[PDB]
Amino acid sequence: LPVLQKESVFQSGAHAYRIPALLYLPGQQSLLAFAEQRAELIVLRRGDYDAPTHQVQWQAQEVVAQARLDGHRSMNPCPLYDAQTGTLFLFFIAIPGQVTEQQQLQTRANVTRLCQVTSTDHGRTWSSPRDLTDAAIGPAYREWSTFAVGPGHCLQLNDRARSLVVPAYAYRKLHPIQRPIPSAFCFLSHDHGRTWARGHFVAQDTLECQVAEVETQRVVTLNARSHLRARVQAQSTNDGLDFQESQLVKKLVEPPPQGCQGSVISFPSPRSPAQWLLYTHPTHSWQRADLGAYLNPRPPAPEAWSEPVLLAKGSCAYSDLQSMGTGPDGSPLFGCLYEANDYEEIVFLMFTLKQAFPAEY
Numbered sequence: 217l218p219v220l221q222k223e224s225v226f227q228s229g230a231h232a233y234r235i236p237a238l239l240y241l242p243g244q245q246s247l248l249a250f251a252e253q254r255a256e257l258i259v260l261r262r263g264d265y266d267a268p269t270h271q272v273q274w275q276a277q278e279v280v281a282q283a284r285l286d287g288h289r290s291m292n293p294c295p296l297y298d299a300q301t302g303t304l305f306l307f308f309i310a311i312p313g314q315v316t317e318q319q320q321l322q323t324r325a326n327v328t329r330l331c332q333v334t335s336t337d338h339g340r341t342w343s344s345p346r347d348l349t350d351a352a353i354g355p356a357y358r359e360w361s362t363f364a365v366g367p368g369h370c371l372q373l374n375d376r377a378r379s380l381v382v383p384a385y386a387y388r389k390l391h392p393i394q395r396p397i398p399s400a401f402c403f404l405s406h407d408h409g410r411t412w413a414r415g416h417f418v419a420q421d422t423l424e425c426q427v428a429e430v431e432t433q434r435v436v437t438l439n440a441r442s443h444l445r446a447r448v449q450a451q452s453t454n455d456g457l458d459f460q461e462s463q464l465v466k467k468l469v470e471p472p473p474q475g476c477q478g479s480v481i482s483f484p485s486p487r488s489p490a491q492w493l494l495y496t497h498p499t500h501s502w503q504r505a506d507l508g509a510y511l512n513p514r515p516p517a518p519e520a521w522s523e524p525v526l527l528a529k530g531s532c533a534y535s536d537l538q539s540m541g542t543g544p545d546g547s548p549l550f551g552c553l554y555e556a557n558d559y560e561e562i563v564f565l566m567f568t569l570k571q572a573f574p575a576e577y
């Protein structure tokens with residue numbers, strides 16, 4: 217398909233950059249591109265949408281120095297823009313850089329921390345890190361071996377409270393001998409991050425997931441990575457606290473046996489339903505290759521997913537999507553950050569709905 221922009225924003229022959237996260241700032245009309253740099257830290261590149269040239273002008277890479285705990289590796293950048301306050305949240309995971317004394321005695325001891333840094337100046341400067349572990353997870357902490365959030369952008373609902381929903385997953389130590397099994401879930405806050413609730417797990421063996429909100433009443437749809445041949449999806453009518461039965465979305469392939477992370481976002485319908493969904497993920501049946509974009513015009517119905525349009529041929533892995541307002545051709549504008557070329561780079565792609573799905577126009 218034709219695109220407005222395609223450029224590598226992170227590159228490393230040593231596969232130093234992985235796990236992309238993209239965040240669009242609607243007022244500034246800018247993007248924040250985050251990635252993990254292998255202790256492991258989170259880096260960022262700011263990019264302004266230059267209307268006159270309809271191109272994002274990426275600035276110099278910088279380390280998010282605040283997004284780190286002493287003696288810990290930082291990973292899984294999970295950004296969010298709070299439309300009510302304008303504040304930016306960068307949630308992330310912190311794990312000890314070396315085996316701890318506790319782990320020497322208990323191999324599966326949980327030593328993973330949930331953290332956040334916030335910005336009130338559009339991401340130029342960040343607050344000192346805040347450890348949300350105890351407040352968000354509580355007594356369930358010891359029942360897991362580790363957990364993570366995202367990766368990729370989180371969600372803010374259009375409910376009265378403008379609730380924050382952070383997609384996550386935990387490796388549950390259910391069997392003393394058998395390896396911990398991961399299950400996806402959501403963290404939910406109705407007060408802009410002051411308090412948090414941990415939602416119930418969806419089906420077992422679900423990893424990295426992302427959530428979006430759509431009209432159908434408003435529901436939260438969770439799209440997760442699986443070890444099966446298809447993606448796993450579930451919907452919640454209570455902001456992610458409880459999900460209805462998980463479903464296999466056969467139209468969205470997953471390459472076994474490991475699967476791959478994918479991204480999903482909602483955007484205003486270009487036409488009965490209020491929102492449509494756009495999702496990106498590799499399209500090869502058993503390899504992480506051929507990144508494709510899929511559309512769901514009647515979300516989140518599993519059977520409504522479109523055939524994918526190829527965004528990039530070849531090696532492609534993890535990706536993150538963001539809607540960026542209206543494009544130069546009048547149709548919705550999108551930004552996508554994805555891993556490519558055997559993890560040697562993270563590429564930024566910008567395209568419109570009209571470019572990707574011409575049949576719609």
Ligand SMILES: [Cl-]
Pocket residue numbers: 241242243244245338
């Ligand atoms: Cl903004």
